[PDB]
């Protein structure tokens, strides 16, 4: 109608631009039949434990930053004293 646009990667429903699919079966259930908050605490606890175990060290070693903060603050306070100017 309007014009033929450029080359994109989304299209719309039907022609989404994906590859040809074959032999895929998908099931589900109505939201009014499933019980919400079922298998929540167990799954959440297990996932949190796994995430803490695996990506923990990538963040923990905020480790030297706090130490350099503390050392810098302490040394700066010490140098601004009576015995620091000797």
């Amino acid at each position: 109608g309007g014009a033929a646009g450029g080359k994109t990667y989304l299209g719309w429903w039907g022609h989404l631009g994906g590859p040809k699919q074959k032999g895929i079966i998908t099931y589900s259930l109505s939201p009014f039949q499933q019980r919400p908050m079922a298998g929540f605490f167990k799954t959440s606890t297990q996932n949190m434990f796994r995430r803490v175990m695996t990506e923990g060290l990538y963040v923990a070693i905020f480790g030297i930053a706090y130490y350099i903060y503390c050392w810098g603050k302490e040394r700066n306070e010490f140098l601004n004293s009576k015995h620091g100017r000797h």
């Binding site: 989304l10 989404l16 699919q21 350099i68």
Partner: protein, 387 residues
């Protein structure tokens, strides 16, 4: 054909808010854009309301603000909400930029969106300064005097630009009038650039944490992602209401409740907290022109990212070196902010210089090297598996 797909305006609404394919596994870090839009709307409304009681002049701005505080009906809510929302804006902006940086969203085909976002960030930073310089307290006066003097670093027409911006020879009535006039206009330009941001993004869709194509599985935005954003909205509301009703002057320094005395220089001349790291970068270099050049580059370097990532993978989900170095850079950023906030003492100068060196090294040396190393290691291990 239904009405929503036939009428022009309803079709415009539907194509962006109701029916729009999205990746089906985007995490909770994809909601910050809606929070940014809500905060911007709140700021626009609150500023429009506040402009009805403010007189932009040297000898009447502070008294007008005080009259707003203690005489206008529910004026404390207005002022506290404006200030606290302006503070939360930069927190959400930093989180948005962090999300865009961690998952490698600057790569094609979303470079134009990245550039538009960078421009919006610069405009927001400029808008924040004029907004905070209006009350004409001690820190506003002295920080404006210091910052607007940086325009003298340009070769030729050096102090002429400063005089033109000041509208005189010092911070007085005309510069407050100029700042009040400009602070009203910039948010509308920001909104227009946000519309451009969204229309540029919509042509290709959002990414996903995995980093692979999401064309195989998609769900419409209307029932699912319009209810996943409500939790974030309510959480942000509960965060901002506590500040507005129990600690309104939270991020606010003690020197911000006094009249602007042009004879008593305060002990420390610092800007608001969200602009501290750039101030530290500026103060790190002993030279003057190099200081402003580095301060500009610290924000302009985000445009060089797409041509600096030599990685076959798109993101840091499956990049062991990237996960480490990203948090290292975040810690360095926090250290830079802390150093910029405090006094320019003996050891702090060395710490700030080292932090600035690391900040400018991370974008220019570390990224290509570790991307190349990861690619090489993975390729070698895969090649040496059959024999």
């Amino acid at each position: 054909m239904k009405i929503l797909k036939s009428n022009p305006f309803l079709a415009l609404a539907n194509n962006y808010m109701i029916d729009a394919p999205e990746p089906s596994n985007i995490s909770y870090f994809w909601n910050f854009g809606s929070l940014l839009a809500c905060v911007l709307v709140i700021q626009i409304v609150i500023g429009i309301l506040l402009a009805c009681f403010y007189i932009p002049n040297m000898d009447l701005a502070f008294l007008s603000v005080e009259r707003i505080v203690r005489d206008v009906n529910y004026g404390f809510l207005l002022r506290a909400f404006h200030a606290n929302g302006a503070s939360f804006f930069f927190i959400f902006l930093y989180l948005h930029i962090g999300r865009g940086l961690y998952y490698g969203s600057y790569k094609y085909p979303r470079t134009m969106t990245w550039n538009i976002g960078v421009i919006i960030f610069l405009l927001t930073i400029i808008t924040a300064f004029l907004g905070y310089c209006l009350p004409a307290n001690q820190m506003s006066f002295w920080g404006a005097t210091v910052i607007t003097n940086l325009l003298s670093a340009v070769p030729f027409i050096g102090d002429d630009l400063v005089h033109l911006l000041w509208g005189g020879f010092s911070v007085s009535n005309p510069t407050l009038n100029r700042f009040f006039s400009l602070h009203y206009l910039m948010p509308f330009v920001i909104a227009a650039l946000s519309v451009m941001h969204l229309i540029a993004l919509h042509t290709n869709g959002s990414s996903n944490p995995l980093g692979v194509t999401a064309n195989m599985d998609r769900i419409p935005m209307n029932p699912y992602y319009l209810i996943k954003d409500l939790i974030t909205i309510f959480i942000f509301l509960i965060g901002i209401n506590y500040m507005a009703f129990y600690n309104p002057y939270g991020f606010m320094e003690p020197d911000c409740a006094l009249p602007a005395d042009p004879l008593k220089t305060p002990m420390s001349i610092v800007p608001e907290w969200y602009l501290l790291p750039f101030y530290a970068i500026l103060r790190a270099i002993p030279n003057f022109q190099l200081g402003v050049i580095a301060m500009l580059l610290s924000i302009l370097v985000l445009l060089l990212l797409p041509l600096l990532d030599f990685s076959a993978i798109r993101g840091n989900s499956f990049n062991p070196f990237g996960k480490f170095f990203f948090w290292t850079f975040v810690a360095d950023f926090v250290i830079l902010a802390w150093i910029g906030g405090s006094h320019p003492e003996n050891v702090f100068i060395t710490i700030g210089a080292i932090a600035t060196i690391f900040y400018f090294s991370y974008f220019f040396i570390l990224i290509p090297v570790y991307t190349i190393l990861g690619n090489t290691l993975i390729d070698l291990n895969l090649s040496s598996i059959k024999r």
